[PDB]
Amino acid sequence: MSRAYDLVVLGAGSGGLEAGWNAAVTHKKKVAVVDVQATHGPPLFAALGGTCVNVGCVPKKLMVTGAQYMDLIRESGGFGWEMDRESLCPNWKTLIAAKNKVVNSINESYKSMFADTEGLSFHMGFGALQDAHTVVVRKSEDPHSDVLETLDTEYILIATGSWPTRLGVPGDEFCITSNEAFYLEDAPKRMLCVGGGYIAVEFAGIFNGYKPCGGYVDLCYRGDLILRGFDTEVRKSLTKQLGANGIRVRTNLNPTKITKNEDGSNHVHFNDGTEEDYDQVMLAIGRVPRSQALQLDKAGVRTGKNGAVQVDAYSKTSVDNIYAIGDVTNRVMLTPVAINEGAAFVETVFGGKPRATDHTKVACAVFSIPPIGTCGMTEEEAAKNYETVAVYASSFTPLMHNISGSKHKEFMIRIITNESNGEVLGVHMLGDSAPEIIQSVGICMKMGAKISDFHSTIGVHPTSAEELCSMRTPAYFYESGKRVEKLS
Amino acid sequence: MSRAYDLVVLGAGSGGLEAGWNAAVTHKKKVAVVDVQATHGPPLFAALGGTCVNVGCVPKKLMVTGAQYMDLIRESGGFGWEMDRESLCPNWKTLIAAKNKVVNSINESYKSMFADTEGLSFHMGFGALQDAHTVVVRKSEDPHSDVLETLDTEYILIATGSWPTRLGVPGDEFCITSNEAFYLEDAPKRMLCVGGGYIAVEFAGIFNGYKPCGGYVDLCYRGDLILRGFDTEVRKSLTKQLGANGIRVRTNLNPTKITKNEDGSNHVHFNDGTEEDYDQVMLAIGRVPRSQALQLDKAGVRTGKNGAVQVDAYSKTSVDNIYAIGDVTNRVMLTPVAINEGAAFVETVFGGKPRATDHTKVACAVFSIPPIGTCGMTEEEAAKNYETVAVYASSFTPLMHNISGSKHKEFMIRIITNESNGEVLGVHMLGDSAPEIIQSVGICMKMGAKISDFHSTIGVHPTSAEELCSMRTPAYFYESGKRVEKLS
Numbered sequence: 001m002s003r004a005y006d007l008v009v010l011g012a013g014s015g016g017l018e019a020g021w022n023a024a025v026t027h028k029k030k031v032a033v034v035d036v037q038a039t040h041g042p043p044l045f046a047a048l049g050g051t052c053v054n055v056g057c058v059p060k061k062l063m064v065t066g067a068q069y070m071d072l073i074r075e076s077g078g079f080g081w082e083m084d085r086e087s088l089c090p091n092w093k094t095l096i097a098a099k100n101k102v103v104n105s106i107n108e109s110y111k112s113m114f115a116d117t118e119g120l121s122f123h124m125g126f127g128a129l130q131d132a133h134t135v136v137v138r139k140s141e142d143p144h145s146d147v148l149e150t151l152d153t154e155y156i157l158i159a160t161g162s163w164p165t166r167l168g169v170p171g172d173e174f175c176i177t178s179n180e181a182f183y184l185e186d187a188p189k190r191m192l193c194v195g196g197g198y199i200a201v202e203f204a205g206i207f208n209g210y211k212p213c214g215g216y217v218d219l220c221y222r223g224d225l226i227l228r229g230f231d232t233e234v235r236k237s238l239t240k241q242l243g244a245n246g247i248r249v250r251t252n253l254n255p256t257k258i259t260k261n262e263d264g265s266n267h268v269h270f271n272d273g274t275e276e277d278y279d280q281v282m283l284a285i286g287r288v289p290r291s292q293a294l295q296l297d298k299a300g301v302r303t304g305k306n307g308a309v310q311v312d313a314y315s316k317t318s319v320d321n322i323y324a325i326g327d328v329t330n331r332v333m334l335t336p337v338a339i340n341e342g343a344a345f346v347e348t349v350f351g352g353k354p355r356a357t358d359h360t361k362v363a364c365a366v367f368s369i370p371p372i373g374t375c376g377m378t379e380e381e382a383a384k385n386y387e388t389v390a391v392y393a394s395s396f397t398p399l400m401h402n403i404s405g406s407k408h409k410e411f412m413i414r415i416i417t418n419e420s421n422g423e424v425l426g427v428h429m430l431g432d433s434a435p436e437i438i439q440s441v442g443i444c445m446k447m448g449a450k451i452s453d454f455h456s457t458i459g460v461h462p463t464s465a466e467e468l469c470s471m472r473t474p475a476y477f478y479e480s481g482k483r484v485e486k487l488s
Numbered sequence: 489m490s491r492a493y494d495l496v497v498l499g500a501g502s503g504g505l506e507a508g509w510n511a512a513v514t515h516k517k518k519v520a521v522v523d524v525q526a527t528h529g530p531p532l533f534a535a536l537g538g539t540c541v542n543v544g545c546v547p548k549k550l551m552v553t554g555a556q557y558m559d560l561i562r563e564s565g566g567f568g569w570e571m572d573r574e575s576l577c578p579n580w581k582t583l584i585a586a587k588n589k590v591v592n593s594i595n596e597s598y599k600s601m602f603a604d605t606e607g608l609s610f611h612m613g614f615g616a617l618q619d620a621h622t623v624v625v626r627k628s629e630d631p632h633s634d635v636l637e638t639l640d641t642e643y644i645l646i647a648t649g650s651w652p653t654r655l656g657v658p659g660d661e662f663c664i665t666s667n668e669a670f671y672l673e674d675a676p677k678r679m680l681c682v683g684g685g686y687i688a689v690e691f692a693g694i695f696n697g698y699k700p701c702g703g704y705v706d707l708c709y710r711g712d713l714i715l716r717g718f719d720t721e722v723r724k725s726l727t728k729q730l731g732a733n734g735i736r737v738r739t740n741l742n743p744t745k746i747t748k749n750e751d752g753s754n755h756v757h758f759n760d761g762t763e764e765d766y767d768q769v770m771l772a773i774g775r776v777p778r779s780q781a782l783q784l785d786k787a788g789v790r791t792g793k794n795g796a797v798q799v800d801a802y803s804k805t806s807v808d809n810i811y812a813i814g815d816v817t818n819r820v821m822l823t824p825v826a827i828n829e830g831a832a833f834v835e836t837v838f839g840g841k842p843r844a845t846d847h848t849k850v851a852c853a854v855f856s857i858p859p860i861g862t863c864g865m866t867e868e869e870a871a872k873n874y875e876t877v878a879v880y881a882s883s884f885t886p887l888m889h890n891i892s893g894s895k896h897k898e899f900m901i902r903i904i905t906n907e908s909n910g911e912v913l914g915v916h917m918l919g920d921s922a923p924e925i926i927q928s929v930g931i932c933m934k935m936g937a938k939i940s941d942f943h944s945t946i947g948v949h950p951t952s953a954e955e956l957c958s959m960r961t962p963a964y965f966y967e968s969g970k971r972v973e974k975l976s
């Protein structure tokens with residue numbers, strides 16, 4: 001035994017890298033980190049850093065911040081900020097230009113992390129399994145390419161994450177995804193986002209901000225309400241608010257056929273049976289784990305829900321030394337989760353003392369033109385398996401939007417409790433500054449929190465978050481199944 | 489006894505009104521709410537609403553929001569928002585114009601409250617005490633003027649709040665205050681705010697945003713560091729950042745003589761001995777309780793430190809039926825505190841079950857050009873009477889300012905724990921979205937929270953608040969009163 005490296009991690013993921021680093025620094029165990037490429041890039045999108053660092057949270061938040069200005073610039077007019085708002089649109093190129101330079105820069109600190117750190121080592125290629133202790137490195141995903149390295153390790157961590165799901169439709173390959181969206185030469189005039197998940201709604205916002213003068217953004221979705229799995233009142237108020245911001249939402253609609261045109265712009269055949277014309281078309285269908293190529297089969301690693309890696313709560317797979325974290329497992333697909341998954345794994349096997357990642361009560365956010373922030377349970381799901389549930393609601397129009405002209409920017413809070421307990425089971429927020437608020441909310445919730453905590457804390461009185469403490473009288477109840485304002 | 493009015497409240501304060509409204513609605517007791525005037529007013533500044541509804545938190549924040557846009561307009565350019573950069577300045581008039589129409593509107597919904605609510609009654613004039621059950625109403629503060637109404641009550645509540653503290657100096661009456669600041673006909677070019685308190689810093693920001701082209705805002709302060717009583721590191725970083733935003737701060741400097749000029753502009757004599765010219769000069773020296781005029785002497789209400797009303801923990805005074813809340817008591821000068829104070833008082837006497845306002849660990853905020861949010865103890869005060877105390881720090885440049893060209897806008901978090909306990913005793917924050925964050929933080933600290941509770945909560949990962957859960961290693965220790973790193 002006594003193998004070449006202690007850990008081979010497939011993928012320099014938000015969690016991959018977190019795992020690798022900690023093992024090599026806090027434990028000195030030699031780590032080899034495999035990944036596809038040096039810096040973020042259009043040929044093969046996800047690089048050293050993660051589907052989050054390179055083509056996710058970083059460039060996303062940047063672009064959403066850029067798109068936010070559009071509203072903000074119009075808004076300041078009411079604040080006596082007079083300027084020529086005559087048909088003023090943004091320059092897409094200068095944004096990506098300055099985006100690339102910031103991401104590129106991040107990949108530069110990463111390279112220079114490996115140079116500085118010992119135990120750690122970056123290996124560029126496409127990693128695959130040979131068996132229990134051998135990781136092969138090839139120059140193509142194609143398993144008949146050149147063998148580049150062959151790494152002999154104690155433990156294997158799989159953090160290859162997730163990938164855009166296409167839809168089985170003629171013309172599919174004319175559609176761009178979250179990946180390609182980022183590196184578009186030019187801003188789309190006629191824009192069609194396709195889907196109802198995070199990426200759909202968030203990107204809907206961006207292109208809407210960065211539409212060239214006169215452009216539009218339609219949003220289509222298979223079902224009747226966007227963002228399945230959110231406070232069904234938050235979902236509605238956002239769909240309305242996207243409207244008021246210029247994004248034409250479209251429920252119970254799906255394309256079936258796509259064909260390219262004379263000037264290159266894309267033509268679309270819909271469910272209702274219409275034909276429309278769009279420069280671009282993006283698909284936010286979802287994300288399948290990236291495990292097709294890994295040959296888990298040849299090492300006996302459990303592959304189920306379209307390739308999701310079977311793991312236990314300590315991230316251990318069907319073999320006792322190979323592990324997987326983040327999107328490839330397909331439980332909770334977020335950056336700070338895989339980060340936690342990676343640190344848990346580090347402490348579990350190298351840290352001596354085990355620890356399991358707590359998936360219950362994780363606060364997350366949606367970065368749409370008005371941002372959403374939830375933590376915990378929906379009404380639907382709390383009344384599902386809880387006996388008596390109270391629902392508190394409160395929706396107010398921030399004092400600044402009377403002047404700004406955006407009287408449609410209703411900020412919204414929803415709290416879901418256990419009537420038997422007082423226990424806060426879910427909190428849902430829509431409006432500006434929500435993703436910040438919710439983060440501390442989830443500190444209270446994973447701590448175990450009761451509404452009799454929430455309201456009995458003195459406020460910070462010119463803010464939005466202070467309205468959490470103003471909720472005593474419930475809006476209505478859910479009695480073992482059905483809404484009611486019950487008695488006896 | 490069967491006295492006419494159950495409760496007379498002197499002053500429709502944020503707390504006064506709250507207490508008034510509560511008694512009348514939840515307990516149906518007849519309440520009469522005396523106050524000076526109808527809507528927010530440039531002759532007698534406060535009104536039906538409170539010193540923060542009328543000449544505080546509302547008009548303040550609107551203006552701060554307005555001033556904020558200056559940065560945001562410059563910043564957007566780096567996001568491809570090309571415009572007429574050409575030294576365009578704000579229009580002060582259209583701001584106050586929209587400000588009044590928004591405040592003025594709030595008082596219109598207040599008059600309509602009184603018309604609609606039963607037991608409640610607004611009485612206009614300057615209130616005073618005759619004895620323990622008799623409130624007199626005069627048309628002037630002058631106790632020699634006309635007797636307007638004489639009100640017979642079971643209970644009296646003093647909620648007259650606070651007033652600008654002037655400085656005993658020649659030229660004093662040439663200065664404007666927080667009150668007069670709001671109604672200035674025109675935007676000041678040559679601006680001097682005086683002092684280093686909440687008001688000073690926040691208003692420094694506003695005029696700095698709302699300076700005409702070429703204008704400058706100087707800040708002077710008696711001592712050597714602004715904002716006595718905040719995390720001594722936060723204070724520094726803010727004093728720096730104000731510099732970067734264009735406000736020339738000045739320490740150990742104090743005016744001595746002010747004289748009015750030929751063109752109207754005001755001339756100033758300083759401590760260092762210089763002479764400088766300013767269009768305006770604001771004094772943020774503080775706020776003494778407004779109890780001089782009340783005639784407590786007659787009714788036997790205890791009057792001590794600058795007239796502040798002596799009260800017990802249940803807000804009760806020297807007499808068994810006269811109460812005082814808010815800024816007049818001088819315990820904790822905030823809107824949501826007096827609200828809580830009033831709310832508790834209502835329960836204390838009319839609500840049957842007494843209850844005391846919890847002054848320990850109240851989160852508050854400062855609405856400066858970068859906003860501050862703190863809750864709990866300073867660095868110095870924990871090491872004062874706590875055995876062994878840890879300090880965690882973290883200062884990061886939010887990912888967006890790499891593009892916005894505001895590389896000076898450092899976000900800051902400081903957590904202060906009880907090393908023995910692990911208990912979070914104080915959290916301090918500087919940066920955009922701070923005040924929103926801090927609010928829920930304070931829900932954690934009246935709940936009792938540990939740094940273990942903090943970091944072990946999963947994050948919301950593109951945000952600023954999530955860096956609360958990124959703090960495991962202390963920066964340095966305070967062992968029984970000294971900056972230290974270990975025990976031996």
Ligand SMILES: Cc1cc2nc3c(=O)[nH]c(=O)nc-3n(C[C@H](O)[C@H](O)[C@H](O)COP(=O)(O)OP(=O)(O)OC[C@H]3O[C@@H](n4cnc5c(N)ncnc54)[C@H](O)[C@@H]3O)c2cc1C
Pocket residue numbers: 010011012013014015016034035036037046047048049050051052053055056057058060125126127128159160161162178199290293325326327328333334335336338339367948949950
């Ligand atoms: C557009 C977008 C925006 C997002 N925004 C947010 C957000 O704001 N907040 C948030 O919390 N989450 C966000 N996420 C989710 C987040 O990106 C993921 O949940 C998280 O990054 C998963 O990380 P991971 O540890 O599984 O590995 P990943 O971060 O997904 O990285 C996987 C790595 O493995 C590499 N790899 C793939 N195949 C191989 C192989 N053949 N051999 C070697 N290496 C390989 C890839 O190149 C990549 O570098 C976003 C996702 C997307 C797509």
Ligand SMILES: Cc1cc2nc3c(=O)[nH]c(=O)nc-3n(C[C@H](O)[C@H](O)[C@H](O)COP(=O)(O)OP(=O)(O)OC[C@H]3O[C@@H](n4cnc5c(N)ncnc54)[C@H](O)[C@@H]3O)c2cc1C
Pocket residue numbers: 460461462498499500501502503504522523524525534535536537538539540541543544545546548613614615616629647648649650666687778781813814815816821822823824826827855
């Ligand atoms: C510029 C400024 C900005 C502020 N911003 C904030 C903020 O952002 N957030 C925050 O939490 N706090 C803020 N405050 C503090 C806040 O104003 C107070 O803490 C709070 O409003 C005090 O309320 P109160 O209950 O004591 O009564 P007040 O709100 O002070 O109301 C007192 C009322 O009594 C009336 N009155 C006075 N004398 C008499 C008498 N002769 N007879 C009858 N009536 C009388 C007055 O007209 C007034 O309407 C700010 C204060 C100022 C000055």
Ligand SMILES: NC(=O)C1=CN([C@@H]2O[C@H](COP(=O)(O)OP(=O)(O)OC[C@H]3O[C@@H](n4cnc5c(N)ncnc54)[C@H](OP(=O)(O)O)[C@@H]3O)[C@@H](O)[C@H]2O)C=CC1
Pocket residue numbers: 167195196197198199200202221222223227228254283284285286287332333334364365366367
């Ligand atoms: N925290 C953050 O800010 C972000 C996190 N992420 C993470 O990455 C993941 C990326 O997945 P994402 O692409 O956003 O989508 P999701 O996984 O959120 O869901 C897919 C959406 O598209 C709809 N859909 C699915 N299949 C089809 C189809 N064949 N035809 C039409 N519509 C279909 C689904 O409808 P239905 O309800 O019927 O299934 C659903 O509403 C997210 O789930 C999240 O975990 C991504 C972006 C931002």
Ligand SMILES: NC(=O)C1=CN([C@@H]2O[C@H](COP(=O)(O)OP(=O)(O)OC[C@H]3O[C@@H](n4cnc5c(N)ncnc54)[C@H](OP(=O)(O)O)[C@@H]3O)[C@@H](O)[C@H]2O)C=CC1
Pocket residue numbers: 655682683684685686687688690709710711715716742772773774775820821822852853854855
């Ligand atoms: N929550 C919010 O957003 C706001 C809350 N408020 C509340 O209302 C109160 C208003 O008081 P504020 O005016 O802001 O200031 P403060 O009452 O907080 O303190 C006064 C400041 O001015 C300095 N000072 C005092 N006297 C003199 C003098 N004679 N000459 C020169 N300098 C002097 C003091 O220095 P030193 O430190 O040496 O004593 C101190 O820095 C605050 O205490 C706060 O509770 C006010 C505004 C906003």
Ligand SMILES: CC(=O)OC[C@H]1O[C@@H](S)[C@H](OC(C)=O)[C@@H](OC(C)=O)[C@@H]1OC(C)=O
Pocket residue numbers: 396397398399461462463464467541546
């Ligand atoms: C009449 C009306 O619609 O309310 C508008 C605002 O009035 C002021 S008193 C407060 O402003 C702020 C920013 O705190 C807040 O009031 C409360 C309810 O405390 C309301 O805003 C908010 C946070 O709801």
Ligand SMILES: CC(=O)OC[C@H]1O[C@@H](S)[C@H](OC(C)=O)[C@@H](OC(C)=O)[C@@H]1OC(C)=O
Pocket residue numbers: 053884885886887949950951958
């Ligand atoms: C070394 C550096 O300063 O930047 C690294 C950034 O990497 C990305 S992964 C994160 O971005 C964001 C905005 O969440 C955040 O990472 C962490 C530390 O969680 C850092 O951003 C920042 C400063 O917050």
Ligand SMILES: [Au+]
Pocket residue numbers: 052053056057058335949950
């Ligand atoms: Au991220």
Ligand SMILES: [Au+]
Pocket residue numbers: 461462502540541544545546823
């Ligand atoms: Au207020």
Ligand SMILES: [Cl-]
Pocket residue numbers: 014050052053057335
């Ligand atoms: Cl990341």
Ligand SMILES: [Cl-]
Pocket residue numbers: 502540541545546823
């Ligand atoms: Cl208020």
